[PDB]
């Protein structure tokens, strides 16, 4: 019933669709853009960061200076400030091995880490991953105590990064001289495109270490006396020696789009060739440089007219520069096609000749300009070389502030060169990044958490100070971006802090409080222990005016409060919302049969908010009414059943009120127990200096208070019943039949009974338990001691105000425990800000907050990387 | 990327009507015929019908068991294909797939379950298959709708557990059986409890099994 024409129509369409996919696969294998997702740079001129490089060149400064004395060397150069500094501890390296380690190895390890932070990748996620390492590097003489062979082989400069970081892609060191780092880049894009790796670190490193290189070039005569490179100038008189690290993180663009990576730029094409039969082993070949430029255009599908900026090799050699300018004039200078003259420059005018790091230092410069739409500036000293023909007007030096203007493709592109003395040449086309086009609990906030992390306390404060400087230097950076970056695009170490602020000015101010040891309002600090969280549900005392009224919006919170409303409305005459939200003729919070069910509701709802935010209890613990809340959080009891237990138990308590009294005695236990002899009982021990004495017979209480006046701090609890005494025995039979239909179940979270004094299964919590819980002493001090000596590291009190937090800390002090004690809401603050602060604090103690579920996803921003705490190591053999 | 997102099924009493949607994306919807194929529980793929592309007349063909009751439509402006089911029967219970193409089905949707039943929501009755290697289990009978989940010792016991596909009895109610094979040391401090859970009737049952 389908005509032959219709059937063959659908096969033809499928065949040509399959053909389109095949040919798209061909294009991917040959020329997929490689996204540059991260970059780091430690270069001369006090350039510890790519952004420092931008500042140095837009400020027209160079870096030539006399040789340092720290190295064991009429002598000027371009030297890195901390070439010898290394945080050996960070990488698990002994100071013995670090001293024996070529600084080139150490600078590569540190700069790779910063590149991974610039790409927003927490390096632990890469362990066991498929990630390659491509280091352009050349052997220098650092060692001319043990581990000296592993610390000086070139192959270990790439493999050591793989080992430390646990990477399992290919790890190569490659030497093509001044082209080494662009060759490393070229090989890594081939490796990605072949699927040998899914991520690659590529770049180059050199540090002048041994006597040779500086005096070797002086006799050779290629050095300038200033130590300044003057590329493309009639004052050209040689290059100034330099050093540095420069690395990039490379990923197939399709994978970067799919994982939502901020892309700094793309490698659109690169080529690598050789001079071949030239005028001599070290002599550049202008025709070879045309061949390589044109090959790069081929593999990027572009022509010269599409590149507006060229970052040249530019060394400042009188006869080297005209060869490069000739080759540029024959390529980029022709068929400009009214795109305006190509703008030419060389980062070497500002930092010297970084040797194996020259090329990726040029890429990094170009990316800096691509961020801003601004041509990357070059010093340009004096007049244009008389040996070069700019008559055409089609090549111009990148003198000052220029707008970087796109090609017919509306895309901004640059070409980057590096030519080696061995003859191996490289050219890379860097294009601007394509358009990137593309759910929160605790929704409205106003304020914003910024979490910080480092391996030691001094490193932690340094991170706070440097982020303070960066934010002061760059106002207008969205606070949601700082927060998401600091939370998700960074690895979290043992020592932690968090600042909670509404605006960049408040964040800077509080970050600087963390940089000092200051204890100020919006600041929390702690160290991250594993061992698990205990949720603590206290007894009487947490109530306040419309506690957590501000939390009623948060959908996961209001959801829970709804179920309590249904259950409590059938069982009692009222609901939770009436009591917490404005109270229009609603039950009084002073009534024991309303405060206990309403507190129950707020604690179960808070505990659900906590869990929705990533905090998982490893155990629960309650105190009188509170174990009912814990029993529901731990799943031993449905919400319906628990709201029934607390409703009926507090109504029973109300029935026996009057004639009762409860007082808090700031004293130990046997002590008060002894004093209790004659002169009625201890109903609660919560802390080694906090007992609650009940016995009612208010007259009695009224007397003990008097006596206590002598020296014992005693205070009356605003309550006219005496629970955990015989005063509750009349309700025994009526309450156990009223709760005969409760259904206790095995707890999903472990449950530590402060009645039994040991973990419970969950099925033991029938109506009989809830009576004993009301009748018997609350043995809470013991319960905390038990949990501490089993390894629990965080106590979170889930309550609208902290009541047991003090007594828990006291118990930990006498146990000399490091364990943290945190709260949830406070009397003044039951808002979403106080809760955000509670999450922030719990984070600094090791609790796992899905910061993305709480805040949402924002954008990666270029914030400072880890603050390495380096000692100096410089072997003098 | 090519997408065919389906929606619009669920429970529905015999004789009533129901319309399924298929929203296309990532390709030129108007260029393709679109077909509906269904699969009754446990059985094969059965053709329901298709609509041609407009270029071929935008006309429709149907299987005999749905002709006059079901109709296929398309809306090329919203890139949506529709199945309009009328006078539904229990026999029309199935997963319904829309698929790109009328002869070559080269892209399918996630499918949409349509359950045709006049049963009312009902909780299960749990009975224990006492352990007459020993075998014991739980028989979860006479509930509606699906699903119902079963675990053993609150998820502690997972080795040797088989929970079986539910069956639909002549009453129109579902029955499921869960079994676990345990060492014949059936008393050695090893109490065995099946935990059955039927959200659509707010039911949670725990049962012990023993001789």
B104, A6: Cβ pair inside 8 Å? no
> Which residues fall within 8 angstroms of residue A711, CB to CB, at 6 or more apart?
none
Q: Among all chains, which residue has been given the structure tokens 């793989």? A: A162
> Which residues fall within 8 angstroms of residue A291, CB to CB, at 6 or more apart?
A273
Within 8 A of B52 by CB-CB distance, chain A residues are: 6
- CA dihedral of A389, A395, A397, A398, whole degrees rounded to 10: 180
B55/B150 same-domain check = no
Q: How many domains does chain B have?
A: 2
B11/B43 same-domain check = yes
Within 8 A of A638 by CB-CB distance, chain B residues are: 204
Q: Can you state the angle between helices A286-300 and A320-331, rounded to 10 degrees?
A: 40
DSSP character at residue A799: S
B202/B157 same-domain check = yes
Domains located in chain A, CATH noted: 24-431 (3.40.47.10), 448-527 (3.30.70.3290), 533-855 (3.40.366.10)
**Pairwise CA distance, residues B48 & B66, whole Å:** 7
Q: Could you tell me if A315 and A321 are in contact, meaning their C-beta atoms sit under 8 angstroms apart?
A: yes
B101, A746: Cβ pair inside 8 Å? no
A748, B154: Cβ pair inside 8 Å? yes
**Within a 10 A sphere around the Cβ of A171, how many other Cβ atoms?**
22
Please tell me which residue of chain B has the smallest CA distance to A10: B104
Please tell me which residue of chain B has the smallest CA distance to A749: B154
Within 8 A of B154 by CB-CB distance, chain A residues are: 745-746, 748
Q: Which of B31, B103, B206 has the CB atom closest to A2's CB atom?
A: B103
Q: Could you tell me if A384 and A233 are in contact, meaning their C-beta atoms sit under 8 angstroms apart?
A: yes
| Count of helices and strands (H, E) across chain A | 28, 29
How close does chain B come to A596, measured CA to CA in Å? Answer: 26
Within 8 A of A10 by CB-CB distance, chain B residues are: 33, 101-104, 106
Chain A, chain B: beta-carbon pairs less than 8 Å apart: 28
- Residue A559, phi then psi, degrees to nearest 5: -60, -50
Q: Which of B32, B56, B205 to mutate to test the interface with A (most CBs of A within 10 A)?
A: B56
The distance in angstroms from the start CA to the end CA of chain A is: 91
Q: Can you say how many angstroms the Cα of residue A501 is from the centroid of all Cα atoms in its chain?
A: 18
Token pair of A362, please?
């040029």
Answer positive or negative: Cα dihedral of A313, A318, A323, A327. positive
**Within a 10 A sphere around the Cβ of A303, how many other Cβ atoms?**
16
B97/B166 same-domain check = no
Q: Which of B103, B106, B204 has the CB atom closest to A7's CB atom?
A: B103
Q: CA–CA distance from A214 to each of A83, A103, A240, A242 (Å)?
A: 16, 17, 10, 10
**Pairwise CA distance, residues A744 & B84, whole Å:** 48
Within 8 A of B104 by CB-CB distance, chain A residues are: 7, 10-11, 14
Q: Which of A14, A638, A745 has the CB atom closest to B104's CB atom?
A: A14
The distance in angstroms from the start CA to the end CA of chain B is: 58
Q: Which of B102, B204, B206 has the CB atom closest to A10's CB atom?
A: B102
Length of chain A as a residue count:
877
B10/B111 same-domain check = yes
B45/B140 same-domain check = no
Q: Which of B100, B102, B105, B199 to mutate to test the interface with A (most CBs of A within 10 A)?
A: B102
B101, A10: Cβ pair inside 8 Å? yes
B7/B111 same-domain check = yes
How close does chain A come to B136, measured CA to CA in Å? Answer: 21
> Which residues fall within 8 angstroms of residue A16, CB to CB, at 6 or more apart?
none
* Closest of A496, A493, A500 to residue A525, by C-alpha: A496
How close does chain A come to B105, measured CA to CA in Å? Answer: 9
In chain A, which among 843-872 make CB contacts under 8 A with chain B? none
Q: CA–CA distance from B124 to each of A271, A547, A595, A741, B175 (Å)?
A: 71, 41, 38, 19, 8
Parallel, antiparallel, or unpaired: how do β-strands B70-75 and A682-685 relate?
Answer: unpaired
How close does chain A come to B117, measured CA to CA in Å? Answer: 31
Task: Work out the angle at residue A496's Cα, subtended by the Cα atoms of residues A490 and A499, and round it to the nearest 5 degrees.
Answer: 90
Q: What is the DSSP string of A266-330?
A: EEEEEEEEE--S-SSTT---HHHHHHHHHHHHHHHT--GGG--EEE------TTHHHHHHHHHHH
Residue that terminates a domain, selected from B116, B151, B170: B116
E strands, B69-202, in order = 70-75, 80-85, 94-100, 107-108, 112-116, 125-129, 134-143, 149-152, 161-163, 167-168, 174-182, 192-198
Answer positive or negative: Cα dihedral of A470, A475, A477, A478. positive
Q: B194 at the A interface (CB within 8 A)?
A: no
Q: CA–CA distance from A284 to each of A220, A275, A294, A322 (Å)?
A: 17, 7, 17, 10
**Pairwise CA distance, residues A371 & A35, whole Å:** 14
A11, B52: Cβ pair inside 8 Å? no
Q: A20 at the B interface (CB within 8 A)?
A: no
Q: A334 at the B interface (CB within 8 A)?
A: no
Q: H or E element: which one contains B50?
A: strand B46-51
B36/B84 same-domain check = yes
B102/B60 same-domain check = yes
Q: Could you tell me if A672 and A691 are in contact, meaning their C-beta atoms sit under 8 angstroms apart?
A: yes
The structure's method of determination equals: X-ray
Q: Can you state the angle between helices A358-372 and A50-58, rounded to 10 degrees?
A: 80
**Pairwise CA distance, residues A296 & A281, whole Å:** 24
Please tell me which residue of chain B has the smallest CA distance to A5: B56
Answer positive or negative: Cα dihedral of A332, A333, A337, A339. positive
Residue B83, classed as helix, strand or coil, is: strand
* Closest of A430, A561, A310, A440 to residue A35, by C-alpha: A430
* Closest of A562, A622, A608, A649 to residue A752, by C-alpha: A622
Q: Among all chains, which residue has been given the structure tokens 């990532």? A: B26
**Pairwise CA distance, residues B149 & B31, whole Å:** 44
> Which residues fall within 8 angstroms of residue A545, CB to CB, at 6 or more apart?
none
Q: Can you state the angle between helices A479-488 and A504-515, rounded to 10 degrees?
A: 40
Q: CA–CA distance from A585 to each of A453, A599, A689 (Å)?
A: 50, 19, 41
Q: H or E element: which one contains A683?
A: strand A682-685
In chain A, which among 472-501 make CB contacts under 8 A with chain B? none
Residue that terminates a domain, selected from B88, B116, B144: B116
In DSSP terms, which residues pair with B129 in a beta bridge? B137
How close does chain A come to B86, measured CA to CA in Å? Answer: 24
How close does chain B come to A7, measured CA to CA in Å? Answer: 6
A14, B56: Cβ pair inside 8 Å? no
Q: Could you tell me if B89 and B114 are in contact, meaning their C-beta atoms sit under 8 angstroms apart?
A: no
Within 8 A of B199 by CB-CB distance, chain A residues are: none
Q: Which of A1, A7, A748 has the CB atom closest to B61's CB atom?
A: A1
Q: CA–CA distance from A56 to each of A40, A205, A244, A348, A876 (Å)?
A: 15, 20, 15, 12, 32
**Pairwise CA distance, residues A184 & A249, whole Å:** 12
In DSSP terms, which residues pair with A418 in a beta bridge? A426
Within 8 A of B196 by CB-CB distance, chain A residues are: none
Within 8 A of A2 by CB-CB distance, chain B residues are: 102-103
Q: Could you tell me if A506 and A523 are in contact, meaning their C-beta atoms sit under 8 angstroms apart?
A: no
**Pairwise CA distance, residues B55 & B80, whole Å:** 17
* Side-chain-side CA neighbours of residue A99 (13 Å): 7
Q: A257 at the B interface (CB within 8 A)?
A: no
Q: Could you tell me if A440 and A406 are in contact, meaning their C-beta atoms sit under 8 angstroms apart?
A: no
* Closest of A293, A245, A310, A238 to residue A77, by C-alpha: A238
Q: Could you tell me if A231 and A312 are in contact, meaning their C-beta atoms sit under 8 angstroms apart?
A: yes
Q: Could you tell me if A396 and A340 are in contact, meaning their C-beta atoms sit under 8 angstroms apart?
A: no
How close does chain B come to A611, measured CA to CA in Å? Answer: 21
A6, B204: Cβ pair inside 8 Å? no
**Pairwise CA distance, residues A186 & A203, whole Å:** 10
Within 8 A of A11 by CB-CB distance, chain B residues are: 104
Q: Which of A5, A9, A766 to mutate to test the interface with B (most CBs of B within 10 A)?
A: A9
Greatest Cα pair distance in chain A: 113
B13/B93 same-domain check = yes
Q: Could you tell me if B153 and B193 are in contact, meaning their C-beta atoms sit under 8 angstroms apart?
A: yes
DSSP character at residue A41: E
**Pairwise CA distance, residues A111 & A117, whole Å:** 10
B204, A745: Cβ pair inside 8 Å? yes
A746, B154: Cβ pair inside 8 Å? yes
Residue that terminates a domain, selected from B55, B83, B116: B116
Q: Could you tell me if A365 and A55 are in contact, meaning their C-beta atoms sit under 8 angstroms apart?
A: no
A746, B103: Cβ pair inside 8 Å? no
DSSP character at residue A662: -
Q: B133 at the A interface (CB within 8 A)?
A: no
E strands, A762-870, in order = 778-779, 794-797, 820-822
In chain B, which among 4-43 make CB contacts under 8 A with chain A? 31, 33
B99/B132 same-domain check = no
**Pairwise CA distance, residues A827 & A830, whole Å:** 7
Residue-wise burial string across A709-724, b where 16 or more C-beta atoms lie within 10 A, e elsewhere: eeeeebeebebebbbb
**Pairwise CA distance, residues A441 & A851, whole Å:** 10
**Pairwise CA distance, residues A433 & A410, whole Å:** 11
Task: Work out the angle at residue B68's Cα, subtended by the Cα atoms of residues B65 and B70, and round it to the nearest 5 degrees.
Answer: 75
Within 8 A of B152 by CB-CB distance, chain A residues are: none
Domain of B40, CATH number, reads: 2.60.40.10
B42/B87 same-domain check = yes
Containing structural domain, residue B198: 125-209
**Within a 10 A sphere around the Cβ of A553, how many other Cβ atoms?**
12
Q: Among all chains, which residue has been given the structure tokens 């990137």? A: A436
Q: A679 at the B interface (CB within 8 A)?
A: no
How close does chain B come to A6, measured CA to CA in Å? Answer: 8
Token pair of A594, please?
């309303």
**Within a 10 A sphere around the Cβ of B106, how many other Cβ atoms?**
16
């Amino acid at each position: 019933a389908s005509t032959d024409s219709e059937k063959v129509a659908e096969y033809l369409r499928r065949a040509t669709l399959d053909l389109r996919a095949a040919r798209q696969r061909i294009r991917e294998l040959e020329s997929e853009p490689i996204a540059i997702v991260g970059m780091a740079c430690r270069l001369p001129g006090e350039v510890d960061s790519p952004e420092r490089l931008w500042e140095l060149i837009t400020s027209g400064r160079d870096s030539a200076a006399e040789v340092p004395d720290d190295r064991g060397w009429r002598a000027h150069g371009n030297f890195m400030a901390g070439a010898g500094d290394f945080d050996a501890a960070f990488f698990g390296i002994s100071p013995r091995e670090a001293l024996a380690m070529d600084p080139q190895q150490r600078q590569a390890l540190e700069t790779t880490w910063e590149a991974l932070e610039s790409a927003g990748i927490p390096p632990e996620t890469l362990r066991g991953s498929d990630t390659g390492v491509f280091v352009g590097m050349s052997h220098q003489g650092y060692a001319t105590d043990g581990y000296l062979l592993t610390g000086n082989t070139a192959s270990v400069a790439s493999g050591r990064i793989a080992y430390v970081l646990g990477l399992e892609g290919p790890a190569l060191t490659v030497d093509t001289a001044c082209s080494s780092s662009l060759v490393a880049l070229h090989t890594a894009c081939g490796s990605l495109r072949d699927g040998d790796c899914g991520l690659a670190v590529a770049g180059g490193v050199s540090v002048m270490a041994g006597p040779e290189v500086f005096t070797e070039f002086s006799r050779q005569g290629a050095l300038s006396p200033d130590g300044r490179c003057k590329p493309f100038s009639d004052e050209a008189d040689g290059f100034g020696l330099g050093e540095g690290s420069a690395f990039v993180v490379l990923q197939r663009l399709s994978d970067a789009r799919r994982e939502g990576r901020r892309v700094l730029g793309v490698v659109a094409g690169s080529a690598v060739n050789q001079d071949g039969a030239s005028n001599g082993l070290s002599a550049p070949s202008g025709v070879a440089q045309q061949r390589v430029i044109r090959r790069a255009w081929a593999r990027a599908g572009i022509t010269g007219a599409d590149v507006a900026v060229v970052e040249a090799h530019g060394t400042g050699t009188r006869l080297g520069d005209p060869v490069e300018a000739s080759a540029l004039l024959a390529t980029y200078g022709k068929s400009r096609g009214s795109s305006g003259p190509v703008l030419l420059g060389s980062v070497k005018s500002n930092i010297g000749h970084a040797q194996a790091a020259a090329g990726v230092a040029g890429v990094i410069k170009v990316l800096l300009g691509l961020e801003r739409g601004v041509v990357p500036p070059m010093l340009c000293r004096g007049e244009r070389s008389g040996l070069i023909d700019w008559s055409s007007g089609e090549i111009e030096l990148a003198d000052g502030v220029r707008e970087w203007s796109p090609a017919a493709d509306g895309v901004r592109r640059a070409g980057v060169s590096a030519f080696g003395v061995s003859g191996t040449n490289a050219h890379v086309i860097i294009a601007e990044p394509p358009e990137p086009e593309p759910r929160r609990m605790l929704p409205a906030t106003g304020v914003v958490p910024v979490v910080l992390s480092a391996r030691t306390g001094a490193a932690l404060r340094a991170q706070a100070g440097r982020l303070a400087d960066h934010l002061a230097a760059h106002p207008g950076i969205a606070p949601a971006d700082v927060s998401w970056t600091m939370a998700r695009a960074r690895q979290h170490f043992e020592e932690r802090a968090a600042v909670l602020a509404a605006d960049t000015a408040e964040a800077v101010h509080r970050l600087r409080a963390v940089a000092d040891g200051a204890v100020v309002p919006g600041v929390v600090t702690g160290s991250a222990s594993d061992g698990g969280s205990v949720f603590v549900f206290p007894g009487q005392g947490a109530q306040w005016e419309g506690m957590a009224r501000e939390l009623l919006p948060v959908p996961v919170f209001a959801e829970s409060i709804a179920e309590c409303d249904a259950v409590l409305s059938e069982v009692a005459g009222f609901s939770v919302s009436e009591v917490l939200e404005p109270r229009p003729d609603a039950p009084s919070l002073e009534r024991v049969d309303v405060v206990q069910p309403v507190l129950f509701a707020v604690m179960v709802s808070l505990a659900r908010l906590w869990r929705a935010c990533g905090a998982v209890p490893s155990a629960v613990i309650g105190h009188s009414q509170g174990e009912i809340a814990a029993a529901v959080v731990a799943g031993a009891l449905s919400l319906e059943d628990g709201m029934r237990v607390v409703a009926r138990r507090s109504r029973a308590v109300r029935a026996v009120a009057g004639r009762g009294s409860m007082l808090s005695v700031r004293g130990g236990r046997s002590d008060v127990e002894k004093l209790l002899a004659d002169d009625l009982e201890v109903a609660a021990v919560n802390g080694p200096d906090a007992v609650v004495v009940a016995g009612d017979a208010q007259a009695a209480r009224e007397f003990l208070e008097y006596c206590e006046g002598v020296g014992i701090r005693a205070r009356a609890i605003p309550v006219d019943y005496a629970s955990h005494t015989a005063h509750v025995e009349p309700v025994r039979d009526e309450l156990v039949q009223a709760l005969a239909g409760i259904t206790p179940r095995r707890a999903e979270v472990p449950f530590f009974s402060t009645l039994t004094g040991d973990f419970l299964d969950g099925t033991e919590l029938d109506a009989g338990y809830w009576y004993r819980n009301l009748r018997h002493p609350v043995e809470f001090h013991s319960a905390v001691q038990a949990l501490t000596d089993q390894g629990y590291a965080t106590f979170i009190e889930v309550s609208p105000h902290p009541v047991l937090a003090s007594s828990v800390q006291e118990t930990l002090d006498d146990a000399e425990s490091d364990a943290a004690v945190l709260g949830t809401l406070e009397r003044d603050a039951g808002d979403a800000d106080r809760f955000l602060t509670a999450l922030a604090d719990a984070h600094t103690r090791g609790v796992a907050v899905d910061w993305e579920a709480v805040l949402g996803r924002a954008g990666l921003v270029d914030l400072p990387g880890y603050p390495f705490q380096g000692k100096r190591f410089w072997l003098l053999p | 990327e090519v997408q065919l997102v389906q929606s619009g099924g669920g429970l529905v009493q015999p004789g009533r009507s129901l319309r399924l949607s298929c929203t296309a994306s990532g390709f030129t919807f108007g260029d393709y015929a679109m077909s509906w194929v269904r699969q009754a529980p446990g059985k094969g793929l059965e053709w329901v019908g298709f609509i041609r592309s407009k270029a071929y007349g935008g006309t429709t063909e149907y299987a005999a068991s749905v002709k006059g009751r079901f109709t296929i439509s398309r809306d090329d402006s919203k890139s949506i294909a529709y199945l309009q089911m009328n006078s539904l029967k229990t026999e029309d219970t199935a997963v319904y797939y829309c698929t790109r193409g009328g002869t070559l089905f080269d892209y399918w949707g996630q499918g949409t379950l349509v359950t045709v039943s006049s049963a009312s929501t009902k909780g299960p009755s749990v009975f224990p298959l006492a352990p007459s290697t020993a075998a014991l289990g739980c028989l979860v009978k006479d509930y509606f709708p699906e699903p119902v989940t079963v675990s053993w010792n609150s998820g502690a016991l997972t080795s040797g557990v088989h929970t079986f596909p539910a069956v639909l009895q002549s009453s129109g109610l579902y029955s499921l059986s869960s079994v676990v094979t345990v060492p014949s040391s059936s008393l050695g401090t090893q109490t065995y409890i099946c935990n059955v859970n039927h959200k659509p009737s707010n039911t949670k049952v725990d049962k012990k099994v023993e001789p």
